[PDB]
């Protein structure tokens, strides 16, 4: 159980593991589920948002942010953590633009944000950012990339990944989908049905689906799904979820 070793993030285990980042893993797996898929000419994002109370307005706690004009922001974990990480990432992108004069590559932004989130992982006076976030972009001269960065600090490249209480579940049902060929039009449908099947209705009901994407379909610009395409995706979901 590691008692006496997991009171700080600068203390290793007898097996050689920092238990703070593992507890952050646990917190992320105890959070909401978000999927993303990169299409042929862009990337799309999907958030399963639980309406804890109908008193909450729609669009509250918006979770699919956009770090840059061409870079989105999907994230699972703590909303305060999500906003702080988004803010530091936005400042990083703005500094990159101010110093280097062009758009930040997704891989380079992921590397910088992973270094920064690591800088909060290994200190003792601070705590690792217990939230896992997504990076997505589309550049006409670079391509499309997707990255998942967890509080552990590892920024690996995933074609399309999920984070939350249905990590393995979403892996099982996103593996059956063929991915690399179709574009956002034929990928939003799959994302919608995947999100609507991973959610549990008997327990943790009352969820809504919000979506966002980046790509040439909006001129390499990240934005939420248009209301018409949004209701069309919901209609395909209700038809396909039967």
């Amino acid at each position: 159980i590691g008692t006496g070793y997991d009171l700080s993030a600068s203390t290793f285990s007898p097996d050689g593991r920092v238990f703070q980042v593992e507890y952050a893993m646990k917190a992320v797996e105890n959070s909401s589920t978000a999927i993303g898929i990169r299409c042929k000419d862009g990337v799309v994002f999907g958030v399963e948002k639980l309406v804890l109370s109908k008193l909450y307005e729609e669009g509250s706690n918006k979770r699919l942010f956009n770090v840059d004009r061409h870079v989105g922001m999907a994230v699972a974990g703590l909303l305060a953590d999500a906003r702080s990480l988004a803010d530091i990432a936005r400042e990083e992108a703005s500094n990159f633009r101010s110093n280097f004069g062009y758009n930040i590559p997704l891989k380079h932004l992921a590397d910088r944000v992973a270094m920064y989130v690591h800088a909060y992982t290994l200190y003792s006076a601070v705590r690792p950012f217990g939230c896992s976030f997504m990076l997505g972009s589309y550049s006409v001269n670079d391509g499309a990339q997707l990255y998942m960065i967890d509080p552990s600090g590892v920024s690996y490249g995933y074609w399309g990944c999920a984070i939350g209480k249905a990590r393995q579940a979403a892996k099982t049902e996103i593996e059956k989908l063929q991915m690399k060929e179709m574009t956002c039009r034929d990928i939003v449908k799959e994302v919608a049905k995947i999100i609507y099947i991973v959610h549990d209705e008997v327990k943790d009901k009352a969820f809504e689906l919000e979506l966002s994407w980046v790509g040439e379909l909006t001129n390499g610009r990240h934005e939420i799904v248009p209301k018409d395409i949004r209701e069309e995706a919901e209609k395909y979901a209700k038809e396909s979820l039967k």
Binding site: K26, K54, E57, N61, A80, R127
Partner: protein, 240 residues
């Protein structure tokens, strides 16, 4: 003690929780209830004033920060007051540099950024104050509830504090009129909400209630015993 995981905000539970943050969240459950409603063009903040003794004044729970934006506090006096001076300074800085009012969403975003630092970094205690934010901007009225977990929500309404679940379920019963109500209607709805929070032996007197209303053309104005008098004259009687 298995709860050695709640002595500072910078340690996680084995189950992946920050128990200090949860205690800060429960802290604002101690303060008095406060419920807010918003119309097509008007947002109301109504709170239940409390007094240390009947021989002394009631503790103010509605705070004015700027002509268009207003806040209501429920929790620690110190943290809420500090947040209020921070709000006033930022609103003034926005008026000075941009000559435009601070957006409600932007204000609440900077509030979240400010209050996340105590949650993340060792040192300052987490801001254990539940804030109800009601203002006006381009797309109309907004009600923002900033939970002491450094989180905020865009809500049609919210009651935060002691026995606020009664007001929560009252508003859950009464969504269907909030959007289309005028000033008096929304005010009476909020008053019925607090009356639901308040037990049987007590009633919403003049000294007991504090009402703050903002709108498109009407600034965030807070009413008192004499000022709440016309608004409570239209108030009905308690369905007891």
């Amino acid at each position: 003690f298995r709860n050695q995981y709640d002595n500072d905000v910078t340690v996680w539970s084995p189950q992946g929780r920050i128990h200090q943050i949860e205690y800060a969240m429960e802290a604002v459950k101690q303060g008095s209830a406060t419920v807010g409603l918003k119309s097509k063009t008007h947002a109301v903040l109504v709170a239940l004033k409390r007094a240390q003794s009947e021989l002394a004044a009631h503790q103010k729970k509605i705070l004015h920060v700027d002509n268009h934006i207003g806040i209501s506090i429920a929790g620690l006096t110190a943290d809420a007051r500090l947040l209020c001076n921070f709000m006033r300074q930022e609103c003034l800085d926005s008026r000075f540099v941009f000559d435009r009012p601070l957006p409600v969403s932007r204000l609440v975003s900077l509030i979240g950024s400010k209050t996340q630092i105590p949650t993340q970094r060792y040192g300052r205690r987490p801001y254990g104050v539940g804030l109800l934010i009601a203002g006006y901007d381009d797309m109309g009225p907004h009600i923002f509830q900033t939970c002491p977990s450094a989180n905020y929500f865009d809500c049609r309404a919210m009651s935060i504090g002691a026995r606020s679940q009664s007001a929560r379920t009252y508003l859950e019963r009464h969504m269907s009129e909030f959007m289309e109500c005028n000033l008096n209607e929304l005010v009476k709805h909020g008053l019925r909400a607090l009356r639901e929070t308040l037990p049987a032996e007590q009633d919403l007197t003049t000294k007991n209630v504090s009402i703050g209303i903002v709108g498109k053309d009407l600034e965030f104005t807070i009413y008192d015993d004499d000022d709440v008098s016309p608004f409570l004259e239209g108030l009905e009687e308690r369905p007891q």
